[PDB]
Subunit: 129 residues, 4 copies
């Protein structure tokens, strides 16, 4: 199921190349994942107060086309695969003209911070997705 | 393909950390960018200068594999090789190790040479090809 | 007239202390100024074609209380001063409980982005302010 | 005593205007303070042993001239004042030609990471600096 999250491009996100810095896309993707979780009632640091957190294990990003200042982007997020301790988010970004700017596949592993050891996924999250 | 490994040190500062107590995963991406830039600089090329010559380098595809976390005040070494080279693009193989030489993570980066103000692929400058010819 | 802009704290804005990095606040302030100008139909990628920009000349931030991950903040922004070439933004950040986290006074100069020289303010900006 | 710290400008620090994003300077200044303390063996490790953290109370930055991609800058840092639970950093940034790009005055409060209330400056710190 698809979750959509709007993102405005600000000066902070751009570089001297006249486009969005390639790492800023990575941050945009994280917000989208965060907001999708929130859409299913989750708060990631009150959730780390119960010592459960999410870390990125692997990420593959393809940049097809650039975003620019004040572009209103849409980040699209899906959970495509689920295992015992990890999640696979399939994500993509489009602009106002529905041009496909880029897309990412993010392997996220459920850990808990003070150990950051792979912990089994919370039972509630399994029920949701 | 000039195989020689280029090494670049990076100190982890507060700005690179998150509430999790480790380095933010996008900061690794910037660290990789810095090392590629320094590798180019070591071979006598400035991207600021190349910009006005209508030459820029943009990331087309990037794969990052996070094995182990970096923390505040760690002194890291970014390692950078060019493994593939084509007309308008080339492939970087990079990885990050800490002081104990623990492999923190590694990346493969596809960089494309473009004309920044029209954002279309262009042949790598001959002098850059010359430096990484072999 | 006061202008309000909501901002969500994400992982990207936090540091190892578990609170928002103080430079992230600076970025938040910039967003609000941009959105404030936008609200008066003053977009800045549109005007860079027009070779006109707003660069920060002086910024003073005073910090009182911290913000944490997933906090929904509010940036309050008002223009308090104006001269032929410059203008002053008075800004502050509060949290959901209306606690004052910090405040900033930002001096901004209108310049040409080519040689970066001080130009006089567009008579339309001084009009709607 | 003046402490110098080099900082290279990268793409990450720049914006679409072709110059360094004004917030990137704030981070540069912190690195320099961090490195200044490190020079006197006051590493984060040393601070945690004192259970001491440093937070910014007030900061005034003055932007005079822009830095650009590939500029090698120098951050110049000095402690100009020290009081009970705080101390004032005076910082400047110059380029390779020693042109003054911008400067900052940073009031830093000595806090306690438990809680972050004012804590008296460590004896070693007040003795290390004058
Ligand atoms: C690098 C770049 C110029 C390569 O141009 P290219 O020769 O068209 O390369 P590709 O064909 O492999 O691009 C893949 C697809 O994106 C399309 N594309 C390229 N530039 C585009 C643009 N400006 N707008 C919309 N689509 C674009 C391509 O047509 C292609 O379509 P298809 O595979 O579905 O048929 C282009 O992909 C690009 O601008 N990527 C974004 C770079 C970036 O911003 N990186 C982050 C900052 S470093
Ligand atoms: C996510 C993580 C807990 C995976 O758990 P895992 O049990 O090690 O599972 P994996 O099989 O994927 O391990 C991958 C490799 O990383 C190594 N590794 C994991 N944690 C390590 C550590 N703390 N120190 C050194 N190596 C470590 C593993 O040994 C493994 O290498 P190997 O083939 O020699 O065994 C761990 O790899 C990790 O912490 N990665 C970094 C996460 C991160 O910092 N992301 C950025 C912030 S979100």
């Amino acid at each position: 199921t698809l979750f959509r999250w709007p993102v405005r491009v600000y000066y902070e996100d751009t570089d001297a190349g006249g486009v969005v810095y390639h790492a800023s896309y990575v941050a945009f993707y994280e917000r989208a994942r965060t907001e999708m979780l929130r859409h299913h009632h989750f708060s990631q640091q009150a959730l780390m107060a119960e010592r459960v957190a999410f870390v990125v294990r692997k990420m593959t990003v393809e940049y097809y086309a650039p975003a620019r200042l004040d572009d209103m982007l849409e980040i699209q997020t899906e959970i495509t695969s689920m295992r015992g301790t990890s999640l696979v988010f399939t994500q993509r970004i489009v602009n106002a003209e529905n041009t496909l700017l880029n897309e990412a596949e993010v392997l996220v592993v459920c850990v808990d911070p003070l150990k950051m050891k792979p912990r089994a996924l919370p039972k509630s999250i399994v029920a949701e997705f």
